Ligand binder design. Structure first.
Ligand SMILES: [Zn+2]
Lengths: 62, 217, 245, 51, 96, 124, 74
């Protein structure tokens, strides 16, 4: 049993590579998709009242 | 150059949405004194520009650390986190990220014997953040290896199918230990990211460039 | 004998004609990067304009804003070309982003080129087709260029004015230098007085002239005070400055 | 023309059949939030689909 | 004809339908289903360690014995604590 | 691919009065969204076979290195102790409740879409 | 081998700090039970504090164990 590895810098660079890939994949592939779903639902839920009142005012059918 | 199609409402999308909203909620934005409207909206957008992305960073660290921590519990696999350089490199990385943010706020200027004592107390966060997670992963694997040898010894020196109650008891103890290792894997990933959020939120504070001139009524 | 050879190779192959002849494949790309590097010669852009002129109507939005910025830097105005660029912008105005439209409107404001349909499509694209915080990321000189463009052409669009008034604040005006901030404040206040539109964010313009009135002359201060009294009457109160606290 | 005009509306959104015509003006109000809630949840739940 | 389709359907039928808590009628011996899951977990561990030890044996264990042998190797080449001595004793035991 | 409502309008205006009630179902089925039917079941993907063969090669390589190791038998028994928990998690975890809990984690799936109402966008 | 003998003695004397950290951790978890009994409406908040508290408390154990490793396998 050894505490230290063969190279501390190699393991540190492995951690940096893995975490930087998780950062790029999060910011680039995951967070656009997440925010497309979330901001569609949130924009509709935040604008339902104003949207329906504006469309009710525009609608000449009544 | 063509991206893949995603089903809306997938379980990984929902899980990562909850995780991101959690680590984003750890450092909430401050309410301004003025009411938020179109006069205050560039001040709010610049406040969001000056705030560091601790939600993205904490989600990054949570996902990579829980992935390595759970890799330690798959068969034929050890955690990368149980290595010293990996886990303590992540810890020194979070401490240096918080320090680089706090230095850049102070104009890239480095910071009455209270100042070296607080310097050592702050600098020990670099040791503690990585050594905690690395020590927990190393201790759990080491404890399992020592415990497994004792359990193996019981049926090696008492017959394969000749000592049922003591072997059953020690395998119950080993199985409860592996369940504890699952709990410790999840907990140490969450602990690393919570302490990451508090260490960077010490320096996340910035000036709100609000309105300098207004119509009073 | 190599020096006579390199003198023969240096005056016949690496010339401006082969430079503008290799720049025919992707001409908004090449005109953009050659104009940024500093190559602003007139005859090359005369060649470049008839290079793009067929294929303008099917260009991308990034290539349209690249070509328009390049011809802004070369200062060469081709009426049929900018009619083609204006028809491209008016054709697929929903695809254009606000920063691209601000660069395009800056080029169309350097010359006096405008249609009613182009102005309505740019205002519709900035207001409705784009994010409402896109003027916040703009920089107040670009928005003041657009405001003076719409004021010069007399096109009144109150929704576009309410959109690009959002970009004027302490932040975006504080990003500018002092002479550029004075020019931007004068342009924005003149356009807002032309339209008769005084939003709640005009005071961040007016304050940017009144926190530092040392750079402003007496007639410019009279103009700023005229817009200040007009905005006081429109917004419904009196204009104070806020101190540090 | 009236059958065609109602056919387009009942093809795009067939949930308009659950409001009788003679009661439609009895639902409205000056603000949209003041429209009578007798049919609103029924309109939304029928518009969500047959499943 | 396909292999992975039958493998998926067969593992589905084994995972969901095949239940030895009701097929063997273990509800009389055991209290609940979760107790059966815990005992099947620990029984899986016991059978696995016995198959590994039973698989390849007789060998000098790298794990610490508590001073107990397998009752057939008092001091041959399996209970030796020194490893080089156990190696040469294994060699003169393998020559036989 | 044009507007489907514009196709509904053109197809309804193009019919005669005698043909309208007969053709309404076909005008409904023409401007209805494409839900693509299930294709023929094929082999596994290139990436799926790469993933399975790479996982098997990693498992074999790690089991080989665990065999070569000094405390080899406790390595191979740690694999049993971990596979036991992967077995017991398939029996313990309430996957329907876990699915709906994760659905509650995201606000996009926690609630229904509250958006356009019928009375606002009606056209009499 | 008096150095290795003192290594075993020093590691066995080194792990005494796990007693104090276990007593403190039990005090903190007993107070978590108490605080959930006082005000269960915020109980899922309190457990979070407990985990965070356990976090920092656990670190004092690991700086013990690290010294043990620095005694044993350095
Ligand atoms: Zn191991």
């Amino acid at each position: 049993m050894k505490l230290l590895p063969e190279s501390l810098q190699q393991e540190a660079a492995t951690a940096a590579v893995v975490a930087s890939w998780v950062l790029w994949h999060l910011d680039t592939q995951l967070l656009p998709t997440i925010m497309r779903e979330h901001k569609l639902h949130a924009c509709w839920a935040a604008a339902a009242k104003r949207y329906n009142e504006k469309l009710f005012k525009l609608n000449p059918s009544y | 150059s063509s991206v893949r199609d995603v089903k809306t409402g997938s379980l990984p999308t929902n899980f990562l949405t909850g995780v991101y909203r959690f680590w984003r909620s750890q450092n909430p934005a401050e309410k301004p004194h003025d009411p938020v409207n179109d006069r205050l909206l560039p001040a709010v957008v610049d406040a969001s520009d000056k705030r560091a992305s601790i939600g993205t960073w904490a989600t990054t660290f949570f996902c990579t650390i829980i992935s390595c921590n759970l890799l330690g519990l798959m068969p034929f696999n050890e955690a990368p986190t149980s290595g010293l350089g990996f886990a303590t490199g992540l810890g020194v990385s979070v401490w240096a990220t918080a320090t680089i943010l706090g230095l850049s706020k102070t104009g890239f200027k480095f910071p009455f014997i209270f100042v070296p004592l607080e310097t050592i107390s702050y600098t020990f966060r670099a040791v503690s953040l990585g050594v905690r997670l690395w020590v927990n992963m190393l201790a759990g694997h080491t404890l399992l290896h020592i415990l497994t040898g004792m359990a193996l010894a019981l049926p090696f020196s008492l017959g394969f199918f000749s000592m049922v109650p003591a072997t059953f008891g020690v395998c119950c103890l080993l199985s409860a230990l592996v369940g504890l290792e699952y709990l410790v894997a999840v907990l140490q990933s969450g602990v690393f990211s919570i302490l990451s959020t508090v260490y960077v939120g010490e320096f996340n504070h910035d000036k709100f460039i609000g309105p300098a001139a207004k119509i009073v009524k | 004998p190599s020096q006579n050879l390199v003198s023969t190779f240096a005056n016949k192959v690496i010339v401006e004609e082969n430079l503008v002849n290799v720049a025919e494949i992707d001409v908004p790309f090449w005109s953009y990067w050659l104009s940024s590097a500093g190559f602003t010669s007139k005859d090359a852009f005369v060649k470049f304009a008839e290079a793009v002129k067929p294929k303008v109507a099917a260009l991308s939005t990034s290539d349209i804003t690249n070509l328009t910025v390049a011809f802004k830097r070369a200062n060469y105005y081709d009426k049929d070309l900018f009619t083609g660029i204006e028809a491209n912008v008016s054709a697929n105005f929903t695809k254009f982003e606000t920063e691209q439209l601000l660069q395009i409107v800056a080029t169309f404001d350097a010359f006096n080129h405008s249609s009613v349909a182009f102005l309505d499509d740019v205002a519709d694209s900035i207001t409705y087709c784009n994010h409402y915080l896109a003027p916040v990321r703009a920089g107040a000189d670009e928005l003041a260029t657009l405001l003076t463009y719409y004021a010069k052409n007399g096109h009144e669009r109150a929704d576009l004015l309410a959109t690009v008034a959002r970009g004027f604040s302490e932040v975006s005006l504080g990003k500018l230098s002092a002479a550029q901030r004075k020019d931007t404040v004068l342009s924005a206040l003149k356009a807002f007085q032309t339209f008769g539109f005084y939003p709640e964010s005009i005071e961040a313009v007016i304050g940017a002239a009144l926190v530092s009135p040392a750079e402003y002359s007496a007639e410019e201060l009279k103009e700023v005070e005229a817009v200040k009294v007009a905005a006081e009457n429109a917004l419904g109160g009196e204009f104070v400055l806020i101190q540090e606290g | 023309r009236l059958l065609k005009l109602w056919a387009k509306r009942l093809l795009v959104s067939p949930e308009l059949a659950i409001v009788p015509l003679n009661e439609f003006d009895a639902q409205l109000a000056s603000k949209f939030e003041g429209i009578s809630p007798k049919y609103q949840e029924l309109l939304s739940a029928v518009a969500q689909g047959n499943k | 004809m396909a292999v992975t389709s039958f493998l998926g359907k067969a593992f589905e039928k084994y995972f969901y339908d095949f239940s030895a808590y009701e097929q063997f009628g273990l509800n009389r011996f055991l209290s609940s289903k979760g107790q059966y899951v815990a005992l099947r977990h620990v029984g899986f561990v016991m059978v696995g360690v016995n198959v590994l030890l039973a698989a390849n044996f007789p060998f000098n264990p790298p794990f610490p014995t508590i001073g107990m042998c397998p009752a057939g190797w008092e001091g041959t080449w399996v209970c030796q604590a020194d490893k080089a001595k156990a190696l040469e004793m294994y060699k003169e035991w393998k020559k036989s | 691919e044009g507007n489907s409502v514009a196709g509904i309008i053109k197809s309804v205006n193009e019919t005669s009065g005698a043909n309208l009630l007969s053709s309404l179902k076909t005008i409904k089925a023409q401007a209805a969204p494409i839900y693509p039917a299930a294709a023929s079941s094929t082999g596994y993907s290139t990436q799926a076979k790469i993933a399975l063969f790479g996982a098997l090669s990693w498992i074999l390589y790690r089991a080989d290195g665990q065999s070569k190791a000094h405390e080899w038998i406790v390595d191979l028994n740690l694999n049993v102790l971990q596979a036991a928990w992967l077995i017991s998690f398939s029996s313990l975890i309430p996957f329907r409740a876990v699915y709906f809990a994760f659905r509650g984690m995201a606000p996009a799936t926690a609630s229904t879409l509250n958006g356009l109402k019928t009375f606002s966008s009606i056209s009499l | 081998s008096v150095l290795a003998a003192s290594k075993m003695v020093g590691a066995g004397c080194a792990t005494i700090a796990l007693a104090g950290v276990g007593a403190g951790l039990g005090v903190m978890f007993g107070s978590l039970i108490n605080g959930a009994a006082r005000n269960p409406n915020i109980a899922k908040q309190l457990v979070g504090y407990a985990l965070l508290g356990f976090a920092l408390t656990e670190s004092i154990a690991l700086f013990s164990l690290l010294v043990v490793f620095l005694i044993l396998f350095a």
